[PDB]
Amino acid sequence: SHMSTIEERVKKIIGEQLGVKQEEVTNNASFVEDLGADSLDTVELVMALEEEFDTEIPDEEAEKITTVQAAIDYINGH
């Protein structure tokens, strides 16, 4: 057992939001194409990540993030 890593925290959020298992979320998976996120899901995902990691993502940067790895990569910075 261990404390939640950055990756585990990101994937739990995505899983709870999109109704998929936290295992089933792969790092290279696209939110819209692979995971099936609609035009509300993606907004609520950013909100959830902002809340979880106590950060503020500008609309410019959020537009860049389209895959799970990109979300993880952004949080490891910033």
Add this chain to the structure above:
Amino acid sequence: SEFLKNPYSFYDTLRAVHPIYKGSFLKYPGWYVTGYEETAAILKDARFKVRTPLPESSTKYQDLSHVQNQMMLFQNQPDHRRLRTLASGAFTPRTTESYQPYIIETVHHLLDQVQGKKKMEVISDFAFPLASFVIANIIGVPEEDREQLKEWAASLIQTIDFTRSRKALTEGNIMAVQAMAYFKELIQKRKRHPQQDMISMLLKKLTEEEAASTCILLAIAGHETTVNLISNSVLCLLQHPEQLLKLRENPDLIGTAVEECLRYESPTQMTARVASEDIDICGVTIRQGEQVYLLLGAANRDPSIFTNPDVFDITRSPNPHLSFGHGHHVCLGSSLARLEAQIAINTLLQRMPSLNLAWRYRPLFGFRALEELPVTFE
């Protein structure tokens, strides 16, 4: 916080770039329209369609989505005309004028409760109770169930705003269940025993769920926006004591004064459309599927239509503001809203000869709504 205190400086910066501005605010990308001519043209154009404020096929908030999607405000052809025509009977000039006695008597009753106190909160003591009493009376909601309506309205209005959260939408879904269940029950009673109200008029073609969502829509509109018009107008006049003296000395100026209050501090700051095809306007191309956000308060400050647009002038004539929208979806209850505001403000100024200010705006971007408005008098 700085945006809420003065959004018009923000609108001005967008307008200087382009009256149709491509950008993204609060994570919502699209075209943000600050120009008057552009706003009016888009609202007039049926190619720019209304749409559900949550994704069409989303069942995350299943009950909230169902309630919203049945409302005429988010419906296009041919369902829009059907729904609008059926509800229109309660808001005709003639029927609206017949509400005047009840509005005058309610206004006096509410001011009686505070007359001796030398102090009041304009929203809680005056603006809200009036608007709540009037709309509940028109719809046919019993006086015992009036407080429950207030809670539903305040919760459901947030579900359409940019400032909405996961928590607000979850709360919204619960209130959607409650409101729909209540109006279905009230419809069953009116089916057996019709009364002199709008529910009965609706039942006299429309499903019982479409009637319920119609009632919910009118209940929210009757509460939220009309309350804001009254309270915004009072603040406006008190911040400009010089056309408040002027309206006090001549109550016949109430008509043109209310219109300038509508232009200057519009209760509704935003509405929205989606492009159903590729559309060329004002030297830009809006592609199919892209979202268009019409900033009505910004359009009302367009210096090419209103000279010295940041000046509050109650003698402005005419006043072709867009506060009630434009085109097919133009406000259904605009006559009622105007009447409530006219009577409320004129009577207040008559009965409180020495009215003075003792401010915070609610965290809504699509609406300009005060948290409270404490005043003193006599």
